[PDB]
Structures are given as C-alpha cells and as structure tokens.
C-alpha cells in the first residue's frame, strides 16, 4: 500500500469516473460471493467488457470525501458498506439493469438502489434508460395510433358489448 500518495490515488484516478461519468450505481454487497465478479465481469464478455468497474471503495472518507468534482447531496450518499459502479464508453442505459435484474434475485442486498449521479438526487430506482436501442419500443410506441389503439376498443363493442 502507501499513505496519502496511495490514498489520493484511489481517489482522483477513480473519481474521473465521476466527473466524466456515464451512468451511476451504489450497491452494497454484504455476503457477496465470487460470482459477484463472475457476473458484472462475466456479462463483460459477450455483452460488456472492461468498460465497467465496481471497485468497492466505500472508504467514504476516501470515496465520499473524495468527490470534489461536483456531486452534492452525497454527504449522505456514501453510507456504510458500498461498491460504487461507473461507465466510460457506451450509453448510460443498460447498466442499471445488470443490477436491477440480478440483485433482485437475492444476490445480496442491493442498497435498495439508493440512486447516484447524472440527474443527481436520492433513492427510488428508474428504468427509462435500458429501453434504449430497443427502438421497437418507440415503434409500437405509436400503438399504431389509428390501428391497435382502435382495434383494442373501437372493436371491443362486439367481443365485450353485445348483450
């Protein structure tokens, strides 16, 4: 290891993933297993990569105190055990799901998704992101307007209104 010369290191070096941070997630991992690194690191194979890091650095005094790069409301955002996660390339979508559709399956606590940066707020997960590049969600998103949204009601008077 090393003192300040090493402490400062883990800081700025990784805090760069905060200044120029794509997405953002804070998940504790009490009772985490190796699959913990056989997942966010496995999905990094044929659907991710070295573009993701969850360097458990909840040293707070290091992680939290180490975020002068504007991330207010975080003097609270850094409680107990933590394992921050950030992105560099790619979009700012998916990622939340790697956690949302993993930790939801036991896989240790998920900090109930305390939310992180980007919009900069508090706790209460969202998902308006992973719907990206799933353009067909913007396709049927018109609900055929005329069609479907019609053949669903304007023609429901027959299979549900003839008495």
């Amino acid at each position: 290891m090393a003192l300040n010369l090493q402490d400062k290191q883990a800081i700025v070096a990784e805090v760069s993933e905060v200044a120029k941070g794509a997405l953002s997630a804070v998940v504790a991992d009490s009772r985490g297993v190796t699959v913990d690194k056989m997942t966010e690191l496995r999905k990094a194979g044929r659907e991710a990569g070295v573009y993701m890091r969850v360097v458990r650095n909840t040293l707070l005094r290091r992680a939290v105190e180490g975020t002068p790069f504007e991330c207010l409301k975080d003097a609270f955002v850094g409680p107990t055990l933590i394992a921050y996660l950030m992105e560099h390339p790619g979009a700012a979508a998916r990622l939340f799901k790697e956690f949302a559709k993993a930790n939801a399956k036991f896989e240790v606590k998920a900090a109930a998704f305390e939310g992180e940066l980007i919009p900069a707020s508090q706790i209460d997960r969202l998902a308006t992101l992973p719907t990206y590049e799933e353009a067909i969600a913007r396709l049927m998103a018109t609900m055929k307007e005329a069609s479907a949204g019609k053949l669903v009601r304007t023609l429901a008077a027959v299979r549900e209104a003839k008495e």
């Binding site: 353009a135 067909i136 396709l139 018109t142 055929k144 307007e145 005329a146 069609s147």
Partner: peptide, 30 residues
C-alpha cells in the same frame, strides 16, 4: 428537432402509411 405540432399532425399519413413508416423504421433487420 423538436418540431412539435407537426411531426405529430403528420398523422394524415393514415394507417397504411404508418406501417410504411415502421416497415422501414427497422427494415433490413430481424
């Protein structure tokens, strides 16, 4: 960009034209 009350009112396209704007709104795909 942000062309509000138009990209919408273009619904004059009517049904078959919307399937025309969807067939290709992906065409050459899955």
């Amino acid at each position: 960009s942000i062309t509000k009350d138009q990209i919408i009112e273009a619904v004059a396209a009517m049904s078959v034209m919307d399937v025309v704007e969807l067939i290709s709104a992906m065409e050459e795909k899955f």
